[PDB]
């Protein structure tokens, strides 16, 4: 492996559940508020952090937009 091929792969590990997590946070879902769909979530405290931080800054976002 390349050490740019290296860094790619040591990148992907980084912060991997902020990174899964707060996208899916960010993700819209008119049904449901971010307290609804973070209820459901069965992965970890950082998760459940990352996930309503992004759902609620990103509703925000959308929210300015008009």
Known sequence: ???KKI??????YKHS???????DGA?????ETCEQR???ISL????IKAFTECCVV???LRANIS
């Open 44 to 47: 970890g405290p950082r998760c």
């Open 17 to 23: 559940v902020v990174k899964k997590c707060c996208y």
């Open 38 to 40: 973070a209820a459901r």
């Open 27 to 31: 993700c819209v879902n008119n049904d």
């Open 7 to 12: 860094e790619e792969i040591a990148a992907k």
């Open 58 to 60: 990103a509703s925000q």
């Open 1 to 3: 492996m390349l050490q």
